[PDB]
Design an enzyme around this catalytic site. Structure first.
Site, PDB file in Angstrom:
ATOM      1  N   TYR A  43       0.805  -1.231   0.000  1.00 42.89           N
ATOM      2  CA  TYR A  43       0.000   0.000   0.000  1.00 42.89           C
ATOM      3  C   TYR A  43       0.833   1.274   0.000  1.00 42.89           C
ATOM      4  O   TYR A  43       0.535   2.186  -0.764  1.00 42.89           O
ATOM      5  CB  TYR A  43      -0.978   0.053   1.176  1.00 42.89           C
ATOM      6  CG  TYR A  43      -2.122  -0.936   1.132  1.00 42.89           C
ATOM      7  CD1 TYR A  43      -2.806  -1.225  -0.060  1.00 42.89           C
ATOM      8  CD2 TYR A  43      -2.556  -1.545   2.304  1.00 42.89           C
ATOM      9  CE1 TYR A  43      -3.866  -2.123  -0.075  1.00 42.89           C
ATOM     10  CE2 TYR A  43      -3.607  -2.446   2.301  1.00 42.89           C
ATOM     11  CZ  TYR A  43      -4.257  -2.729   1.111  1.00 42.89           C
ATOM     12  OH  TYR A  43      -5.300  -3.615   1.119  1.00 42.89           O
ATOM     13  N   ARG A  87      -9.607 -11.737   3.841  1.00 45.21           N
ATOM     14  CA  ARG A  87      -8.968 -11.782   5.165  1.00 45.21           C
ATOM     15  C   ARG A  87      -9.925 -11.441   6.310  1.00 45.21           C
ATOM     16  O   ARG A  87      -9.832 -12.025   7.395  1.00 45.21           O
ATOM     17  CB  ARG A  87      -7.771 -10.829   5.225  1.00 45.21           C
ATOM     18  CG  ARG A  87      -6.581 -11.222   4.364  1.00 45.21           C
ATOM     19  CD  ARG A  87      -5.622 -10.052   4.244  1.00 45.21           C
ATOM     20  NE  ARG A  87      -4.539 -10.336   3.302  1.00 45.21           N
ATOM     21  CZ  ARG A  87      -3.983  -9.442   2.484  1.00 45.21           C
ATOM     22  NH1 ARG A  87      -4.408  -8.180   2.459  1.00 45.21           N
ATOM     23  NH2 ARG A  87      -3.003  -9.816   1.673  1.00 45.21           N
TER      24      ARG A  87
HETATM   25  N1  LIG Z   1      -0.169  -6.250  -3.853  1.00 36.93           N
HETATM   26  C1  LIG Z   1      -0.653  -6.337  -2.621  1.00 36.93           C
HETATM   27  N2  LIG Z   1      -0.302  -5.438  -1.677  1.00 36.93           N
HETATM   28  C2  LIG Z   1      -0.770  -5.501  -0.422  1.00 36.93           C
HETATM   29  N3  LIG Z   1      -0.363  -4.574   0.473  1.00 36.93           N
HETATM   30  C3  LIG Z   1      -0.804  -4.590   1.747  1.00 36.93           C
HETATM   31  C4  LIG Z   1      -0.339  -3.656   2.690  1.00 36.93           C
HETATM   32  O1  LIG Z   1       0.572  -2.881   2.394  1.00 36.93           O
HETATM   33  N4  LIG Z   1      -0.828  -3.859   3.938  1.00 36.93           N
HETATM   34  C5  LIG Z   1      -0.592  -3.170   5.244  1.00 36.93           C
HETATM   35  C6  LIG Z   1      -0.118  -4.158   6.359  1.00 36.93           C
HETATM   36  C7  LIG Z   1       1.104  -5.049   6.009  1.00 36.93           C
HETATM   37  C8  LIG Z   1       0.766  -6.180   5.009  1.00 36.93           C
HETATM   38  C9  LIG Z   1      -0.347  -7.016   5.204  1.00 36.93           C
HETATM   39  C10 LIG Z   1      -0.636  -8.028   4.279  1.00 36.93           C
HETATM   40  C11 LIG Z   1       0.185  -8.203   3.158  1.00 36.93           C
HETATM   41  C12 LIG Z   1       1.292  -7.371   2.962  1.00 36.93           C
HETATM   42  C13 LIG Z   1       1.585  -6.360   3.884  1.00 36.93           C
HETATM   43  C14 LIG Z   1       0.221  -1.849   5.231  1.00 36.93           C
HETATM   44  O2  LIG Z   1       1.471  -1.922   5.231  1.00 36.93           O
HETATM   45  O3  LIG Z   1      -0.449  -0.797   5.255  1.00 36.93           O
HETATM   46  C15 LIG Z   1      -1.713  -5.592   2.117  1.00 36.93           C
HETATM   47  N5  LIG Z   1      -2.141  -6.560   1.197  1.00 36.93           N
HETATM   48  C16 LIG Z   1      -1.671  -6.518  -0.062  1.00 36.93           C
HETATM   49  C17 LIG Z   1      -2.061  -7.461  -1.023  1.00 36.93           C
HETATM   50  O4  LIG Z   1      -2.842  -8.375  -0.768  1.00 36.93           O
HETATM   51  N6  LIG Z   1      -1.545  -7.363  -2.314  1.00 36.93           N
END
Ligand SMILES: Nc1nc2nc(C(=O)N[C@@H](CCc3ccccc3)C(=O)O)cnc2c(=O)[nH]1
Ligand SMILES: Nc1nc2nc(C(=O)N[C@@H](CCc3ccccc3)C(=O)O)cnc2c(=O)[nH]1
EC number: 3.2.2.22
Length: 259
Positions: free
Chosen positions: A119, A176
């Site tokens: 993200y 999720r």
């Molecule tokens: N391509 C893609 N990008 C993703 N990016 C995130 C993401 O950046 N999530 C949060 C929490 C950390 C996290 C949680 C789960 C997986 C990765 C990283 C954050 O950092 O704000 C979340 N899910 C995905 C995803 O399913 N596809």
């Protein structure tokens, strides 16, 4: 080879979206690992490559189709195919880099983005945070078209990044979290697009932490509380797995379950 789940935004209803998310969850989890009534995704350690991914084929009212590839260990969207081209996010490690070579092997044009797919990186490229990006059937309809037209130059990079952000939340985050699925069901029911409120954002941000806290808990009791937010932005504390059973549908594997 890899299992395919189909969804269309064309005439989407609460029921068709519910069926879709249920099917995604069914292909993500094996049933081997359920803790405090909450399923855990497969452990990446020793997981055979023939079991590593699922495919989500998204169609829209514009008669366009794109296929997302999801890593079963975390529901991470690793890339997509549109017709004759496939695009993958910059892999986080060597293992995940090797893994994507097993995806869309018949495609004419293979690309790896120079940017990762988290993200934070996607928000930077979109020029907007998740809190300002509208979600719903309309946004998803438009996201599918934007992903489809990227290879021909019709889609600007900020639009592509925004479109990924929409897809990830409406598919992976909904898989999720039953809570996030519910929020998307509501948007679809009334055909009203809206940006995710703080309850959605904080759940997304806390998925790893919640998974770890549940799995490391003493009989369900957290050693340290986790702070989430309500719809109005007010803070509430989570002390126990119990309150999360209706909220979290799938956990990432973090540790072995205690005897
Ligand atoms: N391509 C893609 N990008 C993703 N990016 C995130 C993401 O950046 N999530 C949060 C929490 C950390 C996290 C949680 C789960 C997986 C990765 C990283 C954050 O950092 O704000 C979340 N899910 C995905 C995803 O399913 N596809
Ligand atoms: N296939 C693939 N997967 C990726 N997964 C992540 C990522 O952050 N994954 C985490 C998500 C769960 C988590 C755990 C602990 C704290 C926050 C979030 C994991 O699987 O342990 C990032 N990037 C990638 C990537 O580029 N390709």
């Amino acid at each position: 080879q890899y299992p395919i789940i189909n969804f269309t935004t064309a005439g989407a209803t609460v029921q068709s979206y519910t069926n879709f998310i249920r099917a995604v969850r069914g292909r993500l989890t094996t049933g081997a690992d359920v803790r405090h009534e909450i399923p855990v995704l497969p452990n990446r350690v020793g997981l055979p490559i023939n079991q590593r991914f699922i495919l989500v084929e998204l169609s829209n009212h514009a008669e366009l189709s794109v296929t997302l590839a999801l890593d079963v260990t975390n529901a991470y969207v690793v890339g997509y195919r549109a017709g004759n081209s496939a695009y993958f996010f910059h892999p986080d490690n060597q293992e995940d880099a090797e893994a994507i070579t097993h995806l869309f092997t018949d495609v004419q044009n293979r690309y790896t983005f120079a940017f990762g797919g988290n993200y934070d990186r996607l928000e930077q490229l979109a020029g907007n945070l998740r809190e300002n990006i509208e979600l719903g059937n309309g946004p998803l309809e438009e996201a599918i078209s934007a992903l489809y037209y990227y290879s021909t130059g019709g889609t600007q990079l900020p639009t592509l990044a925004r479109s990924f952000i929409i897809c990830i939340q409406m598919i992976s985050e909904a898989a999720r979290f039953q809570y996030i699925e519910g929020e998307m069901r509501t948007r679809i029911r009334y055909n009203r697009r809206s940006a995710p409120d703080p309850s959605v954002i904080t759940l997304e941000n806390s998925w790893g932490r919640l998974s770890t806290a549940i799995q490391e808990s003493n009989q369900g009791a957290f050693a340290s509380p986790i702070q989430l937010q309500r719809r109005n932005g007010s803070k509430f504390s989570v002390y126990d797995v119990s309150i999360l059973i209706p909220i979290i549908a799938l956990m990432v594997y973090r540790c072995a379950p205690p005897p």
